[PDB]
Design goal:
The protein is an alpha+beta fold. It has a single domain, classed as 2-Layer Sandwich (Alpha-Beta Plaits). About 30% of the residues lie in helices and about 20% in strands. Strands 2-3-1-4 form a four-stranded antiparallel sheet, with helices on one face. Strand 2 and strand 3 form a beta hairpin. It is globular. The termini are close together. The structure holds copper (I) ion. Copper (I) ion (CU1) binds near residues 13, 15 and 16. It is found in: Cytoplasm.
């Protein structure tokens, strides 16, 4: 798996993001999800070989709000 992070957009409501975090946890690919928008950003160990950040990224956009952009690599 990869180790990208969706750097924080503007929100600081952990309750929003986690609502989607739980759903994203369904994607087998996702190795780990460390939502820390307040502390820095959401650091996520997406499986680029199974599912792309695009998925999760869009997902947290929907009802999470935090996804400025992916960094990592
Ligand atoms: Cu919220």
């Amino acid at each position: 798996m990869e180790q990208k992070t969706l750097q924080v957009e503007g929100m600081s409501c952990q309750h929003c993001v986690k609502a989607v975090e739980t759903s994203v946890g369904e994607l087998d690919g996702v190795s780990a999800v460390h939502v820390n928008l307040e502390a820095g950003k959401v650091d996520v160990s997406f499986d680029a070989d199974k599912v792309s950040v695009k998925d999760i990224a869009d997902a947290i956009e929907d009802q999470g709000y935090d996804v400025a952009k992916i960094e990592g690599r």
